[PDB]
Amino acid sequence: PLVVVLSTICLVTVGLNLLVLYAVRSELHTVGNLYIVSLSVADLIVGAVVMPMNILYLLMSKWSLGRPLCLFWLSMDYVASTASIFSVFILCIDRYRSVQQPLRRTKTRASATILGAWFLSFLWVIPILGWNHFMQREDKCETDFYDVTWFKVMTAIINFYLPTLLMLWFYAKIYKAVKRQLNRERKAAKQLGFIMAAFILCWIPYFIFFMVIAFCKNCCNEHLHMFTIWLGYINSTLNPLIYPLCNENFKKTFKR
Numbered sequence: 001p002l003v004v005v006l007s008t009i010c011l012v013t014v015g016l017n018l019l020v021l022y023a024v025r026s027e028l029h030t031v032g033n034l035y036i037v038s039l040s041v042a043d044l045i046v047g048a049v050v051m052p053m054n055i056l057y058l059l060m061s062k063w064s065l066g067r068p069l070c071l072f073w074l075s076m077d078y079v080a081s082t083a084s085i086f087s088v089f090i091l092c093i094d095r096y097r098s099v100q101q102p103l104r105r106t107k108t109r110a111s112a113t114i115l116g117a118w119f120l121s122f123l124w125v126i127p128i129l130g131w132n133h134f135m136q137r138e139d140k141c142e143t144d145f146y147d148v149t150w151f152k153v154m155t156a157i158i159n160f161y162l163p164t165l166l167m168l169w170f171y172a173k174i175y176k177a178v179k180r181q182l183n184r185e186r187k188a189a190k191q192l193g194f195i196m197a198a199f200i201l202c203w204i205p206y207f208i209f210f211m212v213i214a215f216c217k218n219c220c221n222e223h224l225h226m227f228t229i230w231l232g233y234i235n236s237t238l239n240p241l242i243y244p245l246c247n248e249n250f251k252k253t254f255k256r
Contacts, residue, residue: 006055013047013237023253035091042084046236049076070141075125083121092170149215160207191246202235
């Protein structure tokens with residue numbers, strides 16, 4: 001019942017993101033829409049590499065995937081999540097730059113910034129790779145730290161709440177700059193705000209959920225845990241679904 005729904009979700013996500021990539025390569029193709037490629041590839045990663053592993057983990061309780069396989073799937077999960085987060089962050093920082101800095105280039109620095117974001121995302125693999133090797137179960141497919149709670153909550157902090165406040169600060173700065181300067185820019189701000197809202201609304205449930213469950217006595221809510229997992233994955237799917245409806249140009253692009 002659920003497995004077919006999640007498989008349909010995966011196929012829709014991969015297909016729509018592949019069509020987005022095909023549209024990007026076919027034509028756009030400028031300073032505008034410069035980092036939505038990063039969101040598209042992040043969604044490709046999360047869908048393609050996590051969703052099959054997630055449905056395998058979910059169809060029954062505790063199928064073991066293999067120790068290196070579980071490590072690598074967890075690594076892709078976390079690095080793709082943080083890469084998408086900071087990809088939105090650097091997209092917003094570049095929009096702020098494009099709107100304010102030329103008062104006081106973009107193409108050549110965009111590649112450097114995206115590779116830097118990818119590198120800072122992929123340095124997250126090292127904590128997972130080494131926990132007892134240098135920094136002193138098999139049926140389970142967590143292979144992470146549960147006993148230490150403050151490290152987990154600190155990781156949650158640095159991966160969600162600091163980017164959230166950076167998003168809010170940048171949104172306020174953009175709004176104030178637009179107000180003091182004065183329809184196309186209004187539409188761009190509206191689509192960015194809708195992406196931010198979908199992001200926050202449909203990724204906050206699991207984040208706060210395991211923030212509370214990082215330590216509790218009523219932590220036995222695994223069904224709602226997996227519900228929030230597939231909810232967040234749906235949000236990752238629908239970010240490139242909220243995106244196309246706002247822009248008419250790329251709308252006509254994928255109409256082809």
